[PDB]
């Protein structure tokens, strides 16, 4: 039906990293019924520029996908934490201690007994990288405000059907028990 449509904002769930719900811009919108065809011709067009900005910043920031709100982000498109190899300076010569303690009487209340010392550079990141759910600093990067250049114009099937909050993309069904 319409065409310069008003972008559909994406909601967040600080819980499971995947997003939640979606809805036209509930609040941020002008009130032009007190305007004549000299700025109702410019509000129409400021909104179009907004739509174009949203499109560009969507195609420039998002990581092309096939489902608007994927039910489980793969383990290669979710920002991972790559810390630095932790290096502990092992603070003694084990051989030296054990040796002297056995010998003499040292009960030992760098080192003086032996000038030997070695780091134990470890690994720090993880074993299996994270899989499901993106963090906030990824939500505002993936789910840019979505512009729906035409309304629910089609068969039930083709319809952004990741917008309705009560969607279970796993089973393509609306949840219940409410």
């Amino acid at each position: 039906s319409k065409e310069i449509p008003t972008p559909y904002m994406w909601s967040y769930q600080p819980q499971m990293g995947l997003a939640a719900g979606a809805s036209q811009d509930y609040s941020s919108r002008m009130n032009w019924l007190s305007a004549g065809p000299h700025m109702i011709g410019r509000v129409n067009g400021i909104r179009a520029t907004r739509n174009q900005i949203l499109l560009e910043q969507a195609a420039l920031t998002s990581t092309p996908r096939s489902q608007l709100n994927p039910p489980n982000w793969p383990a290669a498109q979710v920002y991972q934490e790559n810390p630095a190899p932790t290096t502990v300076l092992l603070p003694r010569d084990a051989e030296a201690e054990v040796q002297m303690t056995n010998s003499g009487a040292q009960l030992a209340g760098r080192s003086s007994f032996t000038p030997r010392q070695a780091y134990l550079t470890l690994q720090s990141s993880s074993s299996q990288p994270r899989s499901g759910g993106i963090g906030t600093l990824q939500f505002v990067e993936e789910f840019v405000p979505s512009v729906y250049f035409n309304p629910f114009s089609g068969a039930p099937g083709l319809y952004p059907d990741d917008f309705i909050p009560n969607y279970d993309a796993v089973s393509e069904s609306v949840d219940g028990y409410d």
Partner: protein
């Protein structure tokens, strides 16, 4: 034993906070050009 009545100074109200029926969708004002069905004041029902 009598006493003295208290004292109520009923008077108009500061800044005239009232005489003019300000923000209320049911009774609005208008500042539009004479030959224009438009308006210049919408006055949503949440604004003090």
């Amino acid at each position: 034993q009598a006493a003295p009545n208290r004292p109520n100074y009923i008077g108009f109200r500061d800044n005239f906070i009232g005489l003019m029926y300000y923000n209320s969708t049911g009774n609005m004002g208008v500042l539009a050009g004479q030959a224009s069905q438009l308006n210049a004041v919408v006055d949503l029902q949440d604004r003090n």
